[PDB]
Design a protein around this ligand. Structure first.
Ligand SMILES: [K+]
Ligand SMILES: [K+]
Lengths: 236, 236, 236, 236
């Protein structure tokens, strides 16, 4: 039990453990590539047993379930294994296949279950030493970042309402309502700035200028929040 | 008096005070949602007693006025109650309902008062300690932010003048005048960058490149201003 | 001499000096507003004595020349009066009127001399206490800003070359040559991001992705340069 | 040998050394300008001996090869000469001419070798005192910048998948597949924001809003990484 546990959990234990970690990384990358390529227009049909993409998916899922079963059996205690995030992300990454397999042997639910496979990238943090530190740094500042998001929501509602009320007098305005102007306000406060929605009126232009100024303010506001978490997790 | 105080003002004093604060936050959120929703194209008519949006608005306004009256009567000092901003934001948020009610029982004046109701968001700062801290941090750096805004205005005027004078030789130019170029210059100095207004001439392109460089400078500039206020209120 | 000095130069000396400084600020603002408003299509025709804009310009120029002559006569040293930038910005701002007046009593030369009036904003630095400090902060980091501009130029040339050579295989590409791609590359490295020029090819999209990443790098790069100048002039 | 080595690679050795460095900078700039101007439509043909754009190239390449040969012959040892980056970049800068010359005396391969001439800019680092410091600062932070790029890739894959799956129900959507959405997700996470690809659905707009928020996060992320490298290489 301990031997296989250190073989599958500690890649630095031996060369075989490093090989296992490398093959796990390769399988994760292959599954991600297959998931991305499956949606290409020239590959989709208008699934089945003979589909090569299906075969690669079965191989990846078989490896994932074998690794998960081995780790669960070799875990020192079941509660810790079931409570660890790096294992819950793995158990979420396998269920969408099994739901699909049951139908082989309503479209609204099909929209989300096929989506959940994107989380396959998340066990890369296990094998990436730097990514664990980055995740810890992000988590340590999650409260202040949430507060910043709340402030951004306040500003986005303010500017959306202002621009809609200043643009109500234009017959060709894109802003039909504040819920419609939310997209523009959040794409302005965060400095992306698509050309698909811009004010045309003078008052709308003034409100947009104020929103752009607030966006300049808010693109630099979380910088001190990132500091004192970064430069802090690297020296101690 | 003192019984209903520390209860309508201090949620942490008792469970009843926490319940009152929670219901106040819920009413604020409901009023904000109703304000944003009522202008949707499928909801607006082309007000009245039977309108459900009107009923929810009356409920929210009744709760707001009851809370404001209770707080005013229970305050230990009438002088500072009016001077406090957290109460002026409350008293502004109730006026537009009463103006609307009088007409039920110049159109430009009607649009601004309707916009005034959007200040309902600001009472959320009372129940959010983090928002109070963020507001204090922003207020502590108001003067330097104003200086930065003045510098941005100087740059925006300079670049609008430059781009208009460089673009005067093009018959298809969007920049008809310096006020027209103001929108583009403030959209460039801020890194939003809409595609609705771009120079087409070579000299216009050079001026736009210089404006973009100055925009990188002007949004990388207020970072140290936010610092020494953040990381300062959280450490002292 | 010394009586009108410390009065035309030091507003804080007496109430009369403060009044003179206030009237100078008002004249500068009026001249700037008139300059911006003169180019509006409604006011422009398709100059003369009876033009109200011309009258306001003559009043502003008369005040400027009177103030400059008084300051020059009252200065204790003629050598440094010309060398000081706050006086050279004044002396450029008066020239365009005199050139225009001579014609009333090659068109490319006419557009630049009209343009150079934009520098009327810069005398506001004399009467703004914080603008001088901000200018000193910017000047103290001029060399590193120039280094950053040189790096940005290197990156812009590299990415323009890459995108043009990866996009020449498309008949509908906007990039006709490296100078054409310069505009897109400097619009991408700076995070303005206009939609007027975007790659359409796959290789063009990859090069654009790399340019956008380098743009994030180059917009986050000058922040430490602004620091150690800001927070340095405010503490020492 | 040592005398000419000091004359060539040490611009501070004498006035002649400074002259040699200046002429090398001038030749590099001339080659860059010629390379950029060669692709202009007014100059391209639809090469030969009489082409002036070929003669300037021959002169630049002759100077480059003379300098390279002199430096190689005057070097103290061959290993460091062939291992130093500022010399290997010179090696890459001369080969493309010789390949072109052979043909005068598979088309895609002929195009990439033309592209690789862009590296002519990189010899400017030798003669720029501050560019070496900037390169050292960038190199010292390359390990963490790679991790940041990896995080950006994870986020870009996640958001591309989310936006494609949310936008699958729209017949007019621009997102045909996850690789198509990769361009938009990069353009969003980096705060550039072209208007060529935007979601139109409500769920697509929500996913785009989340991607923009994460883009603000990822543009604020690398600032602390640049610090502790800057302000560190310039003080010790
Ligand atoms: K931006
Ligand atoms: K943009």
């Amino acid at each position: 039990q301990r031997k296989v546990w250190l073989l599958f959990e500690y890649p630095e234990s031996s060369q075989a453990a490093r090989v296992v970690a490398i093959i796990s990384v390769f399988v994760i990358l292959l599954s991600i590539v297959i998931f991305c390529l499956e949606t290409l227009p020239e590959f989709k049909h208008y699934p089945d047993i003979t589909d090569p993409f299906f075969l690669i998916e079965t191989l990846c899922i078989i490896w994932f379930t074998f690794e998960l079963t081995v780790r669960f059996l070799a875990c020192p205690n079941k509660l810790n294994f079931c409570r660890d995030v790096m294992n819950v992300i793995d158990i979420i990454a396998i269920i969408p296949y099994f739901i699909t397999l049951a139908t082989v042997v309503s479209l609204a639910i099909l929209r989300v279950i096929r989506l959940v496979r994107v989380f396959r990238i998340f066990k890369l943090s296990r094998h990436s030493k730097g990514l664990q530190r980055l995740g810890r740094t992000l988590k340590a500042s999650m409260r202040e970042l949430g507060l910043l998001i709340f402030f951004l929501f306040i500003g986005v509602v303010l500017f959306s309402s202002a621009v809609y009320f200043a643009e109500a007098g234009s017959e060709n305005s894109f802003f039909k309502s504040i819920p419609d102007a939310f997209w523009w306000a959040v794409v302005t406060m965060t400095t992306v700035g698509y050309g698909d929605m811009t004010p045309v009126g003078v008052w709308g232009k003034i409100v947009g200028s104020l929103c752009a100024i607030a966006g300049v303010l808010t693109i630099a506001l979380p910088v001190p929040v990132i500091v004192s978490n970064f430069n802090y997790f690297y020296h101690r």
